[PDB]
Design an enzyme around this catalytic site. Structure first.
Site, PDB file in Angstrom:
ATOM      1  N   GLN B  21       0.808  -1.221   0.000  1.00 16.00           N
ATOM      2  CA  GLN B  21       0.000   0.000   0.000  1.00 16.00           C
ATOM      3  C   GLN B  21       0.838   1.265   0.000  1.00 16.00           C
ATOM      4  O   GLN B  21       0.303   2.347  -0.281  1.00 16.00           O
ATOM      5  CB  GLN B  21      -0.962  -0.025   1.190  1.00 16.00           C
ATOM      6  CG  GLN B  21      -0.344   0.164   2.543  1.00 16.00           C
ATOM      7  CD  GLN B  21      -1.358  -0.011   3.649  1.00 16.00           C
ATOM      8  OE1 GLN B  21      -1.657  -1.135   4.103  1.00 16.00           O
ATOM      9  NE2 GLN B  21      -1.855   1.101   4.124  1.00 16.00           N
ATOM     10  N   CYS B  27      -5.244   0.341   3.582  1.00 15.06           N
ATOM     11  CA  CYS B  27      -5.341  -1.044   4.048  1.00 15.06           C
ATOM     12  C   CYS B  27      -6.757  -1.583   3.926  1.00 15.06           C
ATOM     13  O   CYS B  27      -6.959  -2.767   3.628  1.00 15.06           O
ATOM     14  CB  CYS B  27      -4.889  -1.146   5.502  1.00 15.06           C
ATOM     15  SG  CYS B  27      -5.554   0.165   6.638  1.00 15.06           S
ATOM     16  N   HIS B 166      -6.294  -1.240  11.807  1.00 12.15           N
ATOM     17  CA  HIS B 166      -5.566  -1.624  10.615  1.00 12.15           C
ATOM     18  C   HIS B 166      -6.285  -2.789   9.959  1.00 12.15           C
ATOM     19  O   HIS B 166      -6.488  -3.840  10.575  1.00 12.15           O
ATOM     20  CB  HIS B 166      -4.115  -1.953  10.997  1.00 12.15           C
ATOM     21  CG  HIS B 166      -3.318  -2.591   9.912  1.00 12.15           C
ATOM     22  ND1 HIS B 166      -2.956  -1.933   8.761  1.00 12.15           N
ATOM     23  CD2 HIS B 166      -2.739  -3.804   9.830  1.00 12.15           C
ATOM     24  CE1 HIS B 166      -2.234  -2.721   7.995  1.00 12.15           C
ATOM     25  NE2 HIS B 166      -2.128  -3.882   8.603  1.00 12.15           N
ATOM     26  N   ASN B 186      -1.082  -9.333   5.040  1.00  9.55           N
ATOM     27  CA  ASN B 186      -0.971  -7.887   5.205  1.00  9.55           C
ATOM     28  C   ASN B 186      -0.770  -7.267   3.841  1.00  9.55           C
ATOM     29  O   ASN B 186      -0.632  -7.962   2.835  1.00  9.55           O
ATOM     30  CB  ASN B 186       0.177  -7.571   6.152  1.00  9.55           C
ATOM     31  CG  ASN B 186       0.116  -6.199   6.758  1.00  9.55           C
ATOM     32  OD1 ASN B 186      -0.871  -5.479   6.712  1.00  9.55           O
ATOM     33  ND2 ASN B 186       1.232  -5.825   7.361  1.00  9.55           N
TER      34      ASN B 186
HETATM   35 CL   LIG Z   1      -1.520   0.851   7.308  1.00  8.49          CL
END
Ligand SMILES: [Cl-]
Ligand SMILES: [Cl-]
Ligand SMILES: [Cl-]
Ligand SMILES: [Cl-]
Ligand SMILES: [Cl-]
EC number: 3.4.22.27
Lengths: 8, 219
Positions: B21, B27, B166, B186
């Site tokens: 990102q 996110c 997050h 992630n």
């Molecule tokens: Cl983040």
């Protein structure tokens, strides 16, 4: 209660 | 149905490449597209990276979302439902900045018909959803350098709370010599964690809020 995904 | 002891959606070819990102709080958009990507593979047999940028640019104030300043996986799903589609990553690539909405239905790669929110704090229901439905979008408390510096093993952070900040994607679960974990994709590139993944403590009282706000889409 959900918060943005603010303190980024 | 009997729940498996371990699940890994990567082993069904339902998880795309780890993304980066960059310096943009997007996110939420990566988590949302990652969950939809799995459903698209299940529905069509095709594994296609979907456009996080489409969401940053186009799922905006009407959905509580603020592009590189954060947003919601759930309302991202609602935008895809309302918009009747989302473009592929390749057609609408990611720039780690807010841009003018540029959605073009000609490059639609996926649709969304509904989404489902799981009960707060229920890691048993989260386990059931990961096993039977697919990867699940979640929020975690990641505002600790221990999270950014994670390298391997089962992550456990005594300073964590259930206040999540997050957005990430649960693509599986298992245990590492009896230490139970959630397998989390992630969006901080491949140099983060274990090839872009972090294994986070499971059944430790909703550790870091991982089961606080789960949702998943369907096609
Ligand atoms: Cl983040
Ligand atoms: Cl944050
Ligand atoms: Cl915090
Ligand atoms: Cl990357
Ligand atoms: Cl890389």
């Amino acid at each position: 209660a959900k918060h943005r995904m603010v303190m980024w | 149905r009997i729940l498996p002891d371990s699940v890994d959606w990567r082993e069904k070819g339902c998880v795309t490449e780890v993304k980066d990102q960059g310096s943009c709080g997007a996110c939420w958009a990566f988590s949302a597209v990652g969950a939809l990507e799995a459903q698209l593979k299940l529905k069509t047999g095709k594994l296609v990276s979907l456009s996080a940028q489409n969401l940053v640019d186009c799922s905006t104030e009407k959905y509580g979302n603020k592009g590189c300043n954060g947003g919601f996986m759930t309302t991202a799903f609602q935008y895809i439902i309302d918009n009747k589609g989302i473009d592929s990553d390749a057609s609408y690539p990611y720039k780690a900045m807010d841009q003018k909405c540029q959605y073009d239905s000609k490059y639609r790669a996926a649709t969304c018909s509904k989404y489902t929110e799981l009960p707060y704090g229920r890691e048993d229901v989260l386990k059931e959803a990961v096993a039977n439905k697919g990867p699940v979008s979640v929020g975690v408390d990641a505002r600790h350098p221990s999270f950014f510096l994670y390298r391997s093993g089962v992550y456990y952070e005594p300073s964590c709370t259930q206040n999540v900040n997050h957005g990430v994607l649960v693509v599986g679960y298992g245990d590492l010599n009896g230490k139970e974990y959630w397998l989390v994709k992630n969006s901080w590139g491949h140099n983060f964690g274990e090839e872009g993944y972090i294994r986070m403590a499971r059944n430790k009282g909703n550790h870091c809020g991982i089961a606080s706000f789960p949702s998943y889409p369907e096609i």
